[PDB]
Amino acid sequence: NIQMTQSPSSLSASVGDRVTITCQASQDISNYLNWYQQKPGKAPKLLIYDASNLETGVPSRFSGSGSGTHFTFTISRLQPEDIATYYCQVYETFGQGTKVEIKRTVAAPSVFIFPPSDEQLKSGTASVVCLLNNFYPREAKVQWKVDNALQSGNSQESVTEQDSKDSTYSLSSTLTLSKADYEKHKVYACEVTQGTTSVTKSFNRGEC
Amino acid sequence: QVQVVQSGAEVKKPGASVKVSCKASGYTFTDHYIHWVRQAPGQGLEWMGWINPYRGGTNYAQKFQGRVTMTRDTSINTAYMELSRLRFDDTAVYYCARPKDCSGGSCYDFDYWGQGTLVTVSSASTKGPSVFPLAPSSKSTSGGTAALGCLVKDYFPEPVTVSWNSGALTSGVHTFPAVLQSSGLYSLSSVVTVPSSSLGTQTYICNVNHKPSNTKVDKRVEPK
Amino acid sequence: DTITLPCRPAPPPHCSSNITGLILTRQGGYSNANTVIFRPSGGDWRDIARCQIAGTVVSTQLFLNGSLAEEEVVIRSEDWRDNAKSICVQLATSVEIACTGAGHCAISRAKWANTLKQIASKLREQYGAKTIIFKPSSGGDPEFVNHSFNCGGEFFYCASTQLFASTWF
Ligand SMILES: *[C@@H]1O[C@H](CO)[C@@H](O)[C@H](O)[C@H]1NC(C)=O
Ligand SMILES: *[C@@H]1O[C@H](CO)[C@@H](O)[C@H](O)[C@H]1NC(C)=O
């Protein structure tokens, strides 16, 4: 039935500037287009309804306009908490969505390293956890060395959603070894490289 | 005031069926249709159908006809979506959505949503998580701020929730997206930075909830 | 050559009526089929009232002993694009439904066929040169998933599956 075409699929903007999203409807739908904001892990949130109206409690930098087949959603001055995916909707049809992410200055991570717990070692596995806290851009190089030997294949990385307050990212790198291999080596280090600086945090297996 | 609360996450086997509940309150239940919309992981939104709670009528998206049933119990303001013959690509977060007053209004402007229900379609069984401390010391202290956490390991299906001191501690927390291990089980960490001066004096507990297995783990994280 | 509908309890012969209109829901969602699907309304009494073509008799899915349109079938909807708005259908020529007292009410197959064909043609004016399919009620409480009606203080329930299951090209 009624097709939708939402544009662009993703945009990156600095704090404070104006963001515009379009939705093109397959046929004349009058003013029956709604706009939703969806933060990661959360239900969609109604912002604009019947193409123009501001849902009660929505800040006034969110506007919508258009009629017929072409509709416009705009954020006047992008705020940090506006990171989200945005969807138009016509009846049962949702547009493809637009992920708006923020551009900001470079920020260096605070780096922390955690040895396996005593409890986890009992169970026969060792998990060593390296935290990169509140950095930017998303792109980071994390390498693991045990006794100065590069690991390459026994770590897994996970990256947060962009922070709603300071637009930074946080990253975890977890290295997993059996209790056997873990006790075979002494020095555990994760090397965090962000562009002409590498910071290496480490520990000796026994000490604390 | 208006609330829409859904049942908890579940895993179901391929071919089996799931029934998700949606309890509403704070308005006249019979005056608004209840729509179901689902979201596969990192995908868009997909409408499944509506139920009229007044007299039980329904209208399902054509692609689910013959596989979905929507019902309600007006006595407890609860709508249900039952999807059967589950395939793998039915894994998704299932939302109920309540539009503005369906008379005069479109009945498609979704004012209120439930929180969602993750339904995972898989043959593996539930497995509650093992929770290990990521303890603070002088070694996780950079300038009077200390980092501490909980490793939440070896569980299935998604999701877990993590809070700190029963939600009393929120700032600085980073609970990372779960990662699927080569075992087929999920693992994540939640971390928080606090002042080092508090380490000896404020107690720090992470609260892991895994609704799929009806397990809640509280781990006291003590300083080393 | 009849469509003979099973009804519970048995409507007596003097509860026979003329069908003068009906109320539809268009089935939602994407089809890559070039079909449009209609079922007896998934709404309720409020949608029936809004059509303003009932007479004295209270009935669901079919209007019984109501008003007729002047020349041809008339269809109206508050918003054709909104599958949560019911579609009112007013016949120009009525279709008798004759109840035996023995547990059925019957309609002429040919007359119902020609009725559906006219309705389908009006729907094609509204949604395009598409194939039109009528399909049974999607479900609901007993008075609405059945064609139900009040005759003389007693409620009767006729399975309408035979009336809404056909393709019109
Ligand atoms: C419809 O009209 C006929 C003719 O007047 C009448 O006998 C019948 O009872 C009416 N139907 C109902 C359900 O009352
Ligand atoms: C239907 O209407 C015709 C006239 O159009 C009338 O003769 C007939 O008795 C009616 N049938 C019923 C069952 O009311």
Q: Is C15 exposed, middle or buried (0-12, 13-18, 19+ CB in 10 A)?
A: buried
Ligand nearest to the CA of C154: 1
**DSSP string of chain A, one letter each residue:** ---EEEE-SEEEEETTS-EEEEEEESS--TT--EEEEE-TTS--EEEEETTTEEPTT--TTEEEEEETTEEEEEESS--GGG-EEEEEEETTEE---EEEEEE---BPPEEEEE---HHHHHTTEEEEEEEEEEEBSS--EEEEEETTEE--SSEEEEEPPPPTTT--EEEEEEEEEEHHHHHT--EEEEEEESSS-EEEEEEETT--
* Ligand 2 neighbourhood includes C20 CB (under 6 angstroms): no
Nearest CB neighbour to A92, from listed C28, C31, C79: C28
Task: Decide: helix, strand or coil at residue C112.
Answer: helix
CA dist C35 and C38 (Å) reads 10
* Ligand 2 neighbourhood includes C78 CB (under 6 angstroms): no
Q: Phi then psi for C41, rounded to 5 degrees?
A: -45, 135
A142 CA distance to ligand 2 centroid (A)?
85
Q: Which of C65, C94, C99, C115 to mutate to test the pocket of ligand 2 (most atoms within 8 A of CB)?
A: C94
CA dist B38 and C148 (Å) reads 34
Cα→Cα distances B2→A78, B73, B77, C36, Å: 29, 18, 12, 36
* Ligand 2 neighbourhood includes C96 CB (under 6 angstroms): yes
For domain B130-220, the CATH superfamily is Immunoglobulins (2.60.40.10)
The residue of C39, C44, C60 whose CB has the most chain B CBs within 10 angstroms, and thus the best one to mutate to test that interface, is C44
Q: Are strands B117-121 and B92-99 parallel, antiparallel or unpaired?
A: antiparallel
Q: Is the dihedral of CA C6, C7, C9, C11 positive or negative?
A: negative
Nearest CA in chain C to B70: C139
- Which single residue is written with the structure tokens 């979506």? B81
A139 Cβ contact list (under 8 Å, min separation 6)? none
**DSSP string of A97-152, one letter each residue:** -EEEEEE---BPPEEEEE---HHHHHTTEEEEEEEEEEEBSS--EEEEEETTEE--
CA dist B22 and B7 (Å) reads 7
Q: Which residues of A68-97 are buried (b: 16+ CB within 10 A; e: fewer)?
A: eeebbbbbeebeeebbbbbbbbbbbbbbbb
Residue C13 DSSP class = G
Give the long-range contacts of residues A155-162, CB within 8 A, separation 24 or more: A156/B179, A156/B181, A156/B187, A157/B179, A158/B176, A158/B177, A158/B178, A158/B179, A158/B188, A158/B189, A159/B176, A159/B177, A160/B174, A160/B176, A160/B177, A161/A40, A161/A83, A162/A83, A162/A101, A162/A102
**Does the beta-carbon distance from C27 to B60 stay under 8 Å?**
yes
Fold classified for B3-121: Immunoglobulin-like (2.60.40)
Q: Is C98 exposed, middle or buried (0-12, 13-18, 19+ CB in 10 A)?
A: middle
Q: Phi then psi for B64, rounded to 5 degrees?
A: -110, 0
Q: Is the dihedral of CA A137, A141, A142, A147 positive or negative?
A: negative
**Does the beta-carbon distance from A110 to B106 stay under 8 Å?**
no
User: Can B3-121 and B130-220 be said to share one CATH topology?
Assistant: yes
Beta carbons within 10 angstroms of residue A168's beta carbon: 20
Contact B118, B159 (CB under 8 A): yes
B42 Cβ contact list (under 8 Å, min separation 6)? none
Q: Give the residue numbers spanning the domain of C141.
A: 1-169
Q: Is C79 on the interface with B (CB under 8 A)?
A: yes
Ligand nearest to the CA of C156: 1
Chain B residue set in contact with A, beta carbons under 8 Å: 37, 44-47, 61, 95, 100, 106, 108-111, 113-116, 130, 132-135, 137, 139-140, 142, 147, 149, 151, 153, 174, 176-179, 181, 187-189, 191, 193, 224
CA C1 to chain centre: 20
> What is the Cβ-side half-sphere exposure of residue B124, based on CA atoms within 13 angstroms?
15
Q: Which residue is closest in CA terms to ligand 1's atom 7? A: C14
Q: Is C85 on the interface with B (CB under 8 A)?
A: yes
**Does the beta-carbon distance from C140 to B52 stay under 8 Å?**
yes
**Does the beta-carbon distance from C29 to A29 stay under 8 Å?**
no
**DSSP string of C30-91, one letter each residue:** --SSSEEEEEE-SS-HHHHHHH----SS-BSSEEES----SSS-EEE-S-TT-TTS-EEEEE
Token pair belonging to B4: 């829409």
What is the length of chain A?
208
Chain A: give the shortest CA distance to residue C45, in Å.
Answer: 23
Query: First vs last Cα of chain B: how many Å apart?
Result: 47
Q: Is A187 on the interface with B (CB under 8 A)?
A: no
Q: Which amino acid would we find at residue B208? A: V
What domains sit in chain A, N to C, each tagged with a CATH number? 4-103 (2.60.40.10), 110-204 (2.60.40.10)
| Overall number of domains in chain C | 1
Put simply, the chain A residues between 64 and 93 with a CB less than 8 A from any chain B CB are 87, 89, 91-93
Nearest CA in chain A to B192: A133
Task: Decide: helix, strand or coil at residue C119.
Answer: helix
Neighbours of chain C (3+ CB pairs under 8 A): A, B
Torsion (CA) A114, A120, A126, A132 in degrees, nearest 10: -30
In which region does residue A205 sit, left (phi positive, over 0), alpha (psi from -120 to 50) or beta (all else)?
Answer: alpha
